[PDB]
């Protein structure tokens, strides 16, 4: 019966302050002068844009739309860019991965950005090319909140990414919110290390010893290493492997797989996690000792296995079963919540310790989100067709396909692929 | 008792290991080939240089001088195959400071370099102008071990600095070993904030409650804020101030004097100390919250007060008396090593807790060492005159004065004050 407020959860903003930041960010409502009447006019622009009824009121159908996860770019024009209507004065663009996300290993990401780019390359003359040094046309990067351009992010969900239109400087740059659970669209993605299935992805959920696991577990081991099944039925198929995690083991370097040593001192700074400090490739690395400078031993942390997200438990793994208010639990739940969020206790019983965390959810397919972001980098803007890739709101699609609207959009801008013979 | 290996400490070097490295860095003795007659012939070029009995062997005369803190530049030249005998092709030179030391406050450092530059201009037509953005002629920075130029430092004591001869690229650059207790020549310096003497240096030692204090203390304080008397007798003069630290307070930013939060996350990384990450002016800062991105709250860290140096006690003061190897000590000891450096346990007992730190010594004058380095930055080389500022081995001179050797050297380059 009880729906309680957890000791530590991210404070939901008021329907009002939610509408103000939304209209201000995606509509242009005067940052400080977005009071009742001046917003009513705008509120209706938002409403018109989406299928909503141009009431100009904060009706639920509206705030319900405002609450869904979506892109960072606006839905309205900068009140008409006389000077602008972007284009790439060339059909050969170059991109560069400035930085990554721990959720995915470098190759998956690299590939996603690749596949995202082909989407538009399939229907236009546009040809993409990754470069590893110096300035690129499209500079890809991951960041949180404010990351260096005065268009900050907002925490898990809400804004996911954005990109600038074609041009110089940051023109074309695509930026993804580093506070999202970056996946391929269907839950956490972790690429296994060693074991009998090195390189395969953990398969969630997997069946093991009559139990289902939706994340890497250290069950059955005493070395505390996290493993998982690269297939569903671990009994039938015996494929498994080890989940990345810098506190367990490094990948490369010269430490020979020893785990990162936190904090480790590098020059005038003591890092308590992996960094990219002193690197250009955006590959995190770390000191496998307490003084990198002294003993130059180090390793790389190419990915990270997420046990739990948010909460209080700093990522601490769920504990099954766990007691929550007189009821024992054997899985994640929405018990005590409202929203839809599945959580679990990161200790034996919750009542006694009151330590929890969110269970990783479906996250956002980097491919889809990126494909979209790149649509902008080419010059495209949001479409009202909710089926179009360039639509503001995020929607997962098992098997993607460019919407006619999109194809009509990118081509009116770059023309179709050249008809060879 | 024997010689014990302390936690986190560096690995000792042998008398010979040392010599061989010293003759390698400073004399050009081939690493793997520095032995037998080469070690002998070379040992002698070195003994001659420092006016030692040109024995040719490793003898308590040579060794003793080999382990004296000295500049990290060579003693033997090559400036034949090393590009043209350097010399800025203009009297208008510019220096930019890209890094500082937690040992001294931004200003005190900024000055020390300035005063050190002035030491060369006073006798020549050369003028130096600091710049705050861009590629200056002489880039000043502090770094440890390998700090990005192939010529690594070595932790406490030893090579104290190094600089490159005038020229494009890294030429003129002057780098300082960040593992050193940088001081004004007479021991630790701590410019105090607030209190009734804000802006004043801590006076070590200072007498309080009929007792001596050679570092800041939270003593006679309940909040645990560190302070010190800015004059000796705390009674005849009631002036004092609070000593800086990132654990107690911060400066500027928007944190409003709040402590740092370690660790605090800044984008894809967790910082367990202040950093300059992001800045381009070497100023240390830190999140005063657990998520700087989220809270946007931060404050600078201008100087760190130290009551002990190095070790695993991260600064924590000594504990007298303390117990080491069953025995009890009421003062800093050297018990347990071959280098006779003074250390102390930061806890009534060491054996079980194993927490130690180096009793701060006199440190090195940033002024003088800077003065020296800037000498190379201008084209000069080491002197065999122990008086000359350009002599390699470091030596504190309260009343510093350029040697007649130095003045001649610098101005046979540039000529005298116009």
């Amino acid at each position: 019966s009880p729906i309680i407020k957890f000791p530590g959860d991210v404070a939901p903003k008021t329907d009002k302050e939610l509408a103000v930041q939304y209209l201000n960010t995606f509509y242009g409502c005067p940052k400080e002068s977005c009071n009742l009447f001046v917003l009513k006019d705008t509120l209706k622009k938002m409403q018109k844009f989406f299928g909503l009824p141009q009431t100009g009121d904060l009706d639920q159908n509206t705030i319900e739309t405002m609450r869904k996860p979506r892109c960072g770019n606006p839905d309205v024009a900068n009140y008409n860019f006389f000077p602008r209507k972007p284009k790439w004065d060339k059909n050969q663009i170059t991109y560069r991965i400035i930085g990554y996300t721990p959720d995915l290993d470098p190759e998956t990401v690299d590939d996603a950005f690749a596949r995202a780019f082909q989407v538009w390359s399939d229907v236009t003359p546009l040809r993409f090319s990754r470069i590893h040094d110096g300035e690129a046309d499209i500079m890809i990067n991951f960041g949180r909140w404010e990351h260096g351009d005065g268009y900050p992010f907002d925490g898990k969900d809400g804004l996911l990414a954005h990109a600038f239109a074609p041009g110089t400087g940051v023109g074309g740059d695509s930026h993804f919110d580093d506070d999202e659970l970056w996946t391929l669209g269907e839950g956490q993605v972790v690429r296994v290390k060693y074991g009998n299935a090195d390189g395969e992805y953990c398969k969630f959920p997997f069946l093991f010893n009559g139990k289902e696991y939706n994340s890497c577990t250290d069950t059955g081991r005493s070395d505390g290493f996290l493993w998982c099944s690269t297939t569903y039925n671990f009994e039938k198929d015996g494929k498994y492997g080890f989940c990345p995690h810098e506190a367990l083991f490094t990948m490369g370097g010269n430490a020979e797989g020893q785990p990162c040593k936190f904090p480790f001192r590098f020059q005038g700074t003591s890092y308590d996690s992996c960094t990219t400090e002193g690197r250009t490739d955006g590959y995190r690395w770390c000191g496998t000792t307490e003084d990198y400078d002294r003993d130059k031993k180090y390793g790389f942390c190419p990915e990270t296995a997420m046990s739990t997200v948010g909460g209080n438990s700093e990522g601490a793994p769920c504990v099954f079963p766990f007691t929550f208010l007189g009821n024992k639990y054997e899985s994640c739940t929405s018990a005590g919540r409202s929203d839809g969020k599945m959580w679990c206790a990161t200790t034996a019983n919750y009542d006694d310790d009151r330590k929890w965390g969110f269970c990783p959810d479906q996250g956002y397919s980097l491919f889809l989100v990126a494909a979209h972001q790149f649509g902008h980098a080419m010059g495209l803007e949001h479409s009202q067709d909710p089926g179009a890739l360039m639509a503001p709101i995020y929607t997962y699609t098992k098997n993607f396909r460019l919407s006619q609207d999109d194809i009509k959009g990118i081509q009116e801008l770059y023309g179709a692929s050249p008809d060879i013979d | 008792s024997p010689i014990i290996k302390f936690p986190g400490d560096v690995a000792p070097k042998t008398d010979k290991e040392l010599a061989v490295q010293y003759l390698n860095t400073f004399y050009g003795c081939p690493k793997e080939s520095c032995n037998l007659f080469v070690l002998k012939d070379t040992l002698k070029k070195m003994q001659k240089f420092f006016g030692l009995p040109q024995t040719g062997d490793l003898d308590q005369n040579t060794i003793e001088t080999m382990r004296k803190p000295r500049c990290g530049n060579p003693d033997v030249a090559n400036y034949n195959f090393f590009p043209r005998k350097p010399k800025w092709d203009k009297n208008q030179i510019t220096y930019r400071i890209i890094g500082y030391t937690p040992d001294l406050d931004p200003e005190t450092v900024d000055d020390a370099f300035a005063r050190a530059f002035q030491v060369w201009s006073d006798v020549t037509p050369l003028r130096f102008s600091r710049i705050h953005d861009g590629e200056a002629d002489i880039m000043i920075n502090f770094g440890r071990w390998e700090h990005g130029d192939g010529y690594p430092f070595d932790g406490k004591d030893g090579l104290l600095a190094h600089a490159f001869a005038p020229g494009t690229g890294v030429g003129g650059d002057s780098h300082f070993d960040d593992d050193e207790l940088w001081t004004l020549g007479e021991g630790q310096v701590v410019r105090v904030k607030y209190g009734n003497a804000d802006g004043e240096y801590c006076k070590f030692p200072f007498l309080f409650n009929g007792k001596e204090y050679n570092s800041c203390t939270d003593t006679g304080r309940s909040d645990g804020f560190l302070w010190c008397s800015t004059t000796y007798n705390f009674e005849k003069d009631g002036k004092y101030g609070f000593c800086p630290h990132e654990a107690l307070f911060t400066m500027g930013g928007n944190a409003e004097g709040q402590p740092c939060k370690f660790p605090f996350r800044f984008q894809g990384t967790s910082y367990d100390s202040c950093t300059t990450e992001g800045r381009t002016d070497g100023y240390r800062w830190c999140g005063t919250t657990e998520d700087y991105d989220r809270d946007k709250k931060y404050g600078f860290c201008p100087e760190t007060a130290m009551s002990t140096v190095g070790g695993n006690s991260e600064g924590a003061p000594c504990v007298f008396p303390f117990t080491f190897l069953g025995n009890k000590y009421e003062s800093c000891t050297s018990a347990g090593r071959s280098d006779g450096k003074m250390w102390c346990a930061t806890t009534a007992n060491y054996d079980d807790d194993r927490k130690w730190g180096f009793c701060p010594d006199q440190g090195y004058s940033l002024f003088l060492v800077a003065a020296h380095q800037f000498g190379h930055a201008m084209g000069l080389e080491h002197s065999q005159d122990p008086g000359a500022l350009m002599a390699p081995i470091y030596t504190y001179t309260k009343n510093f004065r350029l040697s007649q050797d130095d003045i001649k050297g610098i101005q046979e380059l540039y000529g005298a004050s116009p």
Partner: peptide
């Protein structure tokens, strides 16, 4: 430690 050092 499992979980992981905070940071991305």
């Amino acid at each position: 430690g499992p979980a992981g050092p905070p940071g991305a």
